[PDB]
């Protein structure tokens, strides 16, 4: 953790507290996620979820019996641009890329506050 991810979003969105703002949004942002993404931000989340699902099927992780949920990488934040550290092994670089793409996706999409705390039956 979360923790690294939380730190990435803030790097692109310095004004936010991502565990509060990007949590429980739409159908996908937050625990699980199903149905059709309700907006571009939901789709950001749908993708990220997908990128974690894929990471688990990766050999490089499947050792290192890795958990996307616990995957431990390094990244730096400078001037609101994120760089995933070369020192990452393949598995941790895959996860860092997942987190990186989401960070960025989040900063380019509209925020629809009618989609926070949605009834998943709309999903
Ligand atoms: Ca999700």
- In angstroms, the Cα distances linking 93 to 19, 35, 37, 89, 98 are 23, 29, 26, 6, 9
The question of whether 48 is a catalytic residue gets the answer yes
Residue list for the binding site: 28, 30, 32, 49
Question: Would you list which residues are annotated within the binding site for Ca(2+)?
Answer: 28, 30, 32, 49
Residue 15: C-alpha distances to residues 11, 12, 111, 113 (Å): 9, 9, 13, 16
Tell me how the structure was determined.
Answer: X-ray
Q: What is the resolution of this structure in A?
A: 2.1
Are 55 and 68 a contacting pair, CB within 8 Å? yes
CATH code for the part of the protein at 2-123? 1.20.90.10
3-state secondary structure of 103: helix
Residues shown for the chain: 123
d(CA 101, CA 107): 10
Q: What's the Cα-to-Cα distance from 8 to each of 16, 21, 59, 63, rounded to whole Å?
A: 11, 14, 26, 26
SS (H, E, C) 16-81: CCHHHHCCCECCCECCCCCCCCCCHHHHHHHHHHHHHHHHHCCCCCCCCCCCCCCCCCCEEEECCE
Is 119 a catalytic site residue?
no
Report residue 99: phi and psi, to 5°: -65, -35
Are 55 and 91 in contact by the 8 Å Cβ rule? The answer is yes
């Amino acid at each position: 953790x979360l923790w690294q991810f939380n730190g990435m979003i803030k790097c692109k969105i310095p004004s936010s507290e991502p565990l509060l703002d990007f949590n429980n949004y739409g159908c996908y942002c937050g625990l699980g996620g199903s149905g059709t993404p309700v907006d571009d931000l939901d789709r950001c989340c749908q993708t990220h979820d997908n990128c974690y699902k894929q990471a688990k099927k990766l050999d490089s992780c499947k050792v290192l019996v890795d958990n996307p949920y616990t995957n431990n990488y390094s990244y730096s934040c400078s001037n609101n641009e994120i760089t995933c550290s070369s020192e990452n092994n393949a598995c941790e670089a895959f996860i860092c890329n997942c987190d990186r793409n989401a960070a960025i996706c989040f900063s380019k999409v509209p925020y629809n506050k009618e989609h926070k705390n949605l009834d998943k039956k709309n999903c």
